[PDB]
Amino acid sequence: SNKCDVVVVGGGISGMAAAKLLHDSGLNVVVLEARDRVGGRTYTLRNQKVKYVDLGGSYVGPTQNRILRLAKELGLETYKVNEVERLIHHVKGKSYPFRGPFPPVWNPITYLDHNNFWRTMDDMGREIPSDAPWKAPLAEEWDNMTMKELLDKLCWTESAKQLATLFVNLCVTAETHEVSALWFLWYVKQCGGTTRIISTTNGGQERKFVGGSGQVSERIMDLLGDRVKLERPVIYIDQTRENVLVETLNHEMYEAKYVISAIPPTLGMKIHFNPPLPMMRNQMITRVPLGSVIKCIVYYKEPFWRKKDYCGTMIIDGEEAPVAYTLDDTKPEGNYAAIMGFILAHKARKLARLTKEERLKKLCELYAKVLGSLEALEPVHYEEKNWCEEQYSGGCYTTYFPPGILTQYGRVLRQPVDRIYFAGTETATHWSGYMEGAVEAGERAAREILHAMGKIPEDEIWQSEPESVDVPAQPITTTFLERHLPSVPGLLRLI
Amino acid sequence: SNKCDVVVVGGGISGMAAAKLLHDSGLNVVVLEARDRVGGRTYTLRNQKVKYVDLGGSYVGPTQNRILRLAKELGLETYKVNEVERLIHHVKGKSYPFRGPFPPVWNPITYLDHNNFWRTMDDMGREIPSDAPWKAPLAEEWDNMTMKELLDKLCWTESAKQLATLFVNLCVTAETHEVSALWFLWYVKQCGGTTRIISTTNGGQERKFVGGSGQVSERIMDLLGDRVKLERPVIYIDQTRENVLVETLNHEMYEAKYVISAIPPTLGMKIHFNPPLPMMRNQMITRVPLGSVIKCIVYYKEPFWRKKDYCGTMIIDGEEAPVAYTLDDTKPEGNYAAIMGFILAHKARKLARLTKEERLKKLCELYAKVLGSLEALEPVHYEEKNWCEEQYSGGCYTTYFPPGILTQYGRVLRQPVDRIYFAGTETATHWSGYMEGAVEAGERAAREILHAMGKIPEDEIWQSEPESVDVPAQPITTTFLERHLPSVPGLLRLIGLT
Ligand SMILES: *Cc1cc2c(cc1C)nc1c(=O)[nH]c(=O)nc-1n2C[C@H](O)[C@H](O)[C@H](O)COP(=O)(O)OP(=O)(O)OC[C@H]1O[C@@H](n2cnc3c(N)ncnc32)[C@H](O)[C@@H]1O
Numbered sequence: 001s002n003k004c005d006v007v008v009v010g011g012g013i014s015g016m017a018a019a020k021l022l023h024d025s026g027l028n029v030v031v032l033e034a035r036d037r038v039g040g041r042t043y044t045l046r047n048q049k050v051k052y053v054d055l056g057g058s059y060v061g062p063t064q065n066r067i068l069r070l071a072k073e074l075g076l077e078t079y080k081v082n083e084v085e086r087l088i089h090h091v092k093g094k095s096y097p098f099r100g101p102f103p104p105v106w107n108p109i110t111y112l113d114h115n116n117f118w119r120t121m122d123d124m125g126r127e128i129p130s131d132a133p134w135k136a137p138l139a140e141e142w143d144n145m146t147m148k149e150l151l152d153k154l155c156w157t158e159s160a161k162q163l164a165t166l167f168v169n170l171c172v173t174a175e176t177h178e179v180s181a182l183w184f185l186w187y188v189k190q191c192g193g194t195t196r197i198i199s200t201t202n203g204g205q206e207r208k209f210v211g212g213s214g215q216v217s218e219r220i221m222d223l224l225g226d227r228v229k230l231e232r233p234v235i236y237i238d239q240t241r242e243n244v245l246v247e248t249l250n251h252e253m254y255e256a257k258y259v260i261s262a263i264p265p266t267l268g269m270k271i272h273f274n275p276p277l278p279m280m281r282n283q284m285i286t287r288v289p290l291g292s293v294i295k296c297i298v299y300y301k302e303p304f305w306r307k308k309d310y311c312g313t314m315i316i317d318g319e320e321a322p323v324a325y326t327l328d329d330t331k332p333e334g335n336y337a338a339i340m341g342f343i344l345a346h347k348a349r350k351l352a353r354l355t356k357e358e359r360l361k362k363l364c365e366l367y368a369k370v371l372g373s374l375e376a377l378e379p380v381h382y383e384e385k386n387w388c389e390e391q392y393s394g395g396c397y398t399t400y401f402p403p404g405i406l407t408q409y410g411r412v413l414r415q416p417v418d419r420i421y422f423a424g425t426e427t428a429t430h431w432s433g434y435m436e437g438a439v440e441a442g443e444r445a446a447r448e449i450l451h452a453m454g455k456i457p458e459d460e461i462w463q464s465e466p467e468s469v470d471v472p473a474q475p476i477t478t479t480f481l482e483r484h485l486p487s488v489p490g491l492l493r494l495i
Numbered sequence: 496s497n498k499c500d501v502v503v504v505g506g507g508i509s510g511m512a513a514a515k516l517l518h519d520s521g522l523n524v525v526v527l528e529a530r531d532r533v534g535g536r537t538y539t540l541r542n543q544k545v546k547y548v549d550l551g552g553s554y555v556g557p558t559q560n561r562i563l564r565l566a567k568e569l570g571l572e573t574y575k576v577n578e579v580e581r582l583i584h585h586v587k588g589k590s591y592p593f594r595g596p597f598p599p600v601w602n603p604i605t606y607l608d609h610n611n612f613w614r615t616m617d618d619m620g621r622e623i624p625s626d627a628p629w630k631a632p633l634a635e636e637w638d639n640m641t642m643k644e645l646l647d648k649l650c651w652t653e654s655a656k657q658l659a660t661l662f663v664n665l666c667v668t669a670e671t672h673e674v675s676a677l678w679f680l681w682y683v684k685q686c687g688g689t690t691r692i693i694s695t696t697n698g699g700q701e702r703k704f705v706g707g708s709g710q711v712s713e714r715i716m717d718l719l720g721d722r723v724k725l726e727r728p729v730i731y732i733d734q735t736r737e738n739v740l741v742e743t744l745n746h747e748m749y750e751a752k753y754v755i756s757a758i759p760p761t762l763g764m765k766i767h768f769n770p771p772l773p774m775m776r777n778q779m780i781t782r783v784p785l786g787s788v789i790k791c792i793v794y795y796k797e798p799f800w801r802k803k804d805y806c807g808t809m810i811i812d813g814e815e816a817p818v819a820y821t822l823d824d825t826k827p828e829g830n831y832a833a834i835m836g837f838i839l840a841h842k843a844r845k846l847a848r849l850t851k852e853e854r855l856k857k858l859c860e861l862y863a864k865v866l867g868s869l870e871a872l873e874p875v876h877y878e879e880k881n882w883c884e885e886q887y888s889g890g891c892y893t894t895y896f897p898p899g900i901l902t903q904y905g906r907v908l909r910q911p912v913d914r915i916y917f918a919g920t921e922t923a924t925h926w927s928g929y930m931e932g933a934v935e936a937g938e939r940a941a942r943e944i945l946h947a948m949g950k951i952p953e954d955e956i957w958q959s960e961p962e963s964v965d966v967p968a969q970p971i972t973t974t975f976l977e978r979h980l981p982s983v984p985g986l987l988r989l990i991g992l993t
């Protein structure tokens with residue numbers, strides 16, 4: 001057997017961030033990666049047609065100071081997602097260009113309903129602790145309701161209900177009726193609220209890495225050399241003896257003092273445990289699916305949308321549209337012009353039966369309609385990835401909690417099992433579900449093991465991150481009218 | 496590599512019934528079983544204090560003709576669960592004895608709401624095909640609401656909402672807010688409806704096996720001899736070559752023409768697949784958890800409750816009660832007097848924090864109050880099993896579907912993946928979740944493979960079961976008034992119009 005101080009299961013950003021911190025503290029680390037590659041839910045494809053493209057996680061932005069710091073130390077640079085020209089909201093077969101992060105509305109009742117919905121998501125969020133959403137004062141009430149129920153209660157207009165549905169589908173790649181209200185409200189709040197989570201400029205989608213996010217995991221693998229084992233799916237963990245034993249599918253045995261599980265919670269199911277897991281984790285890891293998404297990038301000769309004062313951002317309401325959301329994926333130079341689109345949730349399941357060519361055709365036709373341009377019908381290249389297919393992801397972007405699970409099993413996610421500590425973006429308290437969360441969770445799990453070894457004190461397990469000098473955050477502001485305009489039932493009760 | 500015709504993964508009832516059918520038709524089978532025993536979600540404990548007790552699946556009843564035929568052929572007998580004396584419905588700290596399957600009400604408004612609740616469960620169920628619940632005309636609308644939402648719309652009284660909530664908790668060991676309305680309605684309909692599923696006499700809970708349900712799996716293991724491999728958890732299935740390779744955790748390798756997967760759907764996750772599963776199954780096996788229950792048996796000197804004209808059946812509403820449902824678990828000889836209780840859904844999680852002794856004390860105190868009996872505080876023995884702990888079950892009794900899953904992923908549950916066929920009670924169309932559904936699924940999967948091999952025609956894959964001559968089924972009947980009395984909203988509409 002191959003002896004070390006710590007085995008990390010998973011060579012995603014979270015596993016790699018963990019292994020780097022432990023290695024940098026002078027411990028011997030092994031990273032056991034199931035796939036022939038590192039990066040996990042990040043994946044950068046290189047070819048001559050795209051140069052590079054993020055088919056998995058891509059965007060970073062202000063307040064994501066851990067992934068920005070790790071990436072800068074690895075020699076990476078960011079560029080800004082194109083948001084110079086107008087965003088488009090496509091509603092009832094028509095494109096409404098706009099500026100500012102929130103699609104505007106003109107009907108005064110619809111205005112009150114939209115304003116109240118966004119404001120209420122943040123008001124509810126203010127009562128949800130980031131590190132313990134189950135301690136929300138209304139935790140059971142919010143957890144025993146789906147986001148569909150909350151939207152049916154909140155939204156007096158079909159316009160607001162359609163946009164709020166798209167918001168849920170886009171943010172967590174799941175249907176409103178699939179997810180806990182408490183969990184979804186936690187998710188938005190732990191990213192700093194509605195504005196921060198939905199924003200390109202001054203939000204989560206502001207920036208990409210030059211050369212792709214995959215370089216984060218690849219460059220940590222570069223530091224670690226053959227301490228990283230590719231095509232080592234972990235099948236068995238035995239804690240009954242003096243050192244922990246970890247076995248891979250190809251019959252290698254690794255012996256360590258500690259283990260970091262840096263995989264999505266449910267992918268714990270792929271490992272056989274001796275002794276059995278404690279009951280609450282044994283059931284928790286059956287209750288926590290990941291969402292459903294096809295990430296699709298269509299390439300063009302030029303970023304032609306810019307010529308009509310469109311930035312390439314499309315927000316597309318309704319059942320018919322295969323893609324509800326797009327961003328300009330063009331490179332900083334104005335070349336490899338591209339639209340990034342998400343096929344979300346049930347649409348990722350329905351449109352999977354089509355061929356690659358059939359999806360390209362559908363997307364090109366939708367883009368032509370929304371951008372009002374025949375150029376959208378002339379793609380030079382297409383790349384796509386269905387994350388629903390992935391045995392060692394289970395989906396993307398992240399794990400969602402169905403109604404009832406977060407209050408009953410949420411405490412279990414980070415709780416150590418003997419000498420196994422838990423990383424993975426799912427266990428983060430800030431931008432959980434993001435590459436930022438992956439770094440927070442890996443460094444924290446690494447530091448829990450340094451503390452178990454007597455190397456650092458308790459108060460250094462959780463560590464604040466200095467603000468990026470390169471990507472400073474601007475404050476989230478509201479207007480007097482946003483804070484004080486009544487809800488629809490507000491305006492009704494007054495009459 | 497050990498060569499055979501069919502590797503069966505799982506030696507529960509589903510796997511052992513599959514194995515048996517294949518063996519009887521002259522094929523070489525291997526059963527690979529994770530545990531040091533067969534039975535799975537059935538487990539009969541034997542010691543001198545209890546003689547035998549079912550800590551897992553126990554009850555069989557009329558219309559469950561496949562498990563009755565299999566058990567009869569294996570030499571087993573059934574006896575009747577005691578329902579001679581009165582049932583108890585305990586609500587708001589008081590016990591109301593009754594007779595008949597449904598807890599009665601007297602308040603006329605509350606009577607209309609109770610009758611309408613049960614009638615509407617059955618009305619909705621008749622819209623839902625047993626073999627394709629996602630083809631129900633309103634499948635999307637029903638699957639996109641939880642049973643909590645449905646009971647909030649249906650029940651115009653708290654009395655009905657509290658009884659309906661217990662019905663869900665007890666039937667599927669999950670909360671109303673955890674489960675799809677479509678899935679629950681399907682689950683009840685495929686068991687023959689509300690009356691059949693809740694009933695002791697003429698229903699699911701009518702009988703037990705003399706000596707325990709574990710003997711079904713044991714006696715098939717006896718017939719198969721060393722074809723059954725204990726402590727062989729399957730870790731890897733490879734379908735890239737002519738013959739399927741199945742690897743176990745102890746590095747043994749099995750080679751077959753076909754595999755039957757007879758494990759709970761989510762326990763599919765414990766196997767690494769080459770090539771990867773198709774997309775829809777890959778995601779479906781992360782979306783289908785099992786429920787939560789502790790089965791608890793408290794032993795007494797005598798079945799003292801019978802002397803107060805109580806059969807031992809207690810239906811106990813609300814939050815404080817650790818146990819919402821009990822049955823008499825006394826042996827047919829009238830000795831090893833015992834009460835079987837379920838700790839259901841969130842209570843199975845919450846009370847797992849206590850010691851065995853503390854759970855025994857809380858059950859005795861509850862039973863003392865409900866039965867109006869200090870003797871309930873004098874247990875002679877206690878056995879319990881928290882199925883939430885089992886690595887190779889995931890929970891009990893069975894897999895539930897959260898909102899949105901059965902319409903998106905339902906069709907893949909029993910869809911073959913190349914040379915892999917799916918057994919397990921979860922894949923049944925009649926008494927899915929039960930030992931009955933385990934037999935139907937195991938035999939149907941075996942027959943799918945017999946057809947793939949050209950040994951039987953396609954119209955022999957699905958086979959009806961002759962009705963037991965030993966446990967014949969009384970039909971489910973209603974009265975005119977039960978069929979035609981209005982709902983509460985119906986009565987209000989009449990009042991308006993008048
Ligand atoms: C899929 C996706 C995700 C995504 C996104 C768009 C798509 C299509 N957009 C993002 C965005 O713009 N910005 C962002 O910050 N995040 C975005 N995401 C999500 C992001 O990619 C993830 O949050 C992040 O990558 C998570 O990293 P983490 O390290 O937590 O998890 P992982 O990447 O899944 O890594 C797991 C690794 O473990 C391996 N594995 C799995 N099972 C085993 C076993 N049994 N043995 C050994 N290794 C195992 C996996 O192969 C993987 O490499």
Ligand SMILES: *Cc1cc2c(cc1C)nc1c(=O)[nH]c(=O)nc-1n2C[C@H](O)[C@H](O)[C@H](O)COP(=O)(O)OP(=O)(O)OC[C@H]1O[C@@H](n2cnc3c(N)ncnc32)[C@H](O)[C@@H]1O
Nearest residue numbers: 505507508509529535536552553554729891919920928930
């Ligand atoms: C838990 C329970 C269930 C139950 C019940 C009360 C409790 C506490 N009451 C019942 C009742 O009164 N009447 C009834 O008809 N059903 C009742 N149930 C349910 C019943 O026990 C189950 O429906 C039935 O036993 C299920 O049978 P099936 O054969 O479908 O499934 P299983 O019993 O879980 O067997 C699966 C076997 O597979 C093994 N396993 C799991 N993973 C692997 C791997 N990777 N490799 C190999 N073997 C594996 C398990 O160990 C098990 O033996």
Ligand SMILES: O=C(/C=C/c1ccccc1)c1cccc(C(F)(F)F)c1
Nearest residue numbers: 102103163166167170171197198315
């Ligand atoms: O939630 C949003 C985007 C989330 C996101 C998450 C991960 C990767 C890319 C985008 C969002 C963005 C712009 C507008 C809207 C809105 F207002 F709902 F349409 C939502």
Ligand SMILES: O=C(/C=C/c1ccccc1)c1cccc(C(F)(F)F)c1
Nearest residue numbers: 597598658661662665666692693810
């Ligand atoms: O649904 C019931 C029982 C289901 C069941 C399933 C498996 C094993 C034992 C009980 C039930 C039984 C008696 C009364 C009631 C009722 F009416 F809801 F209170 C329900």
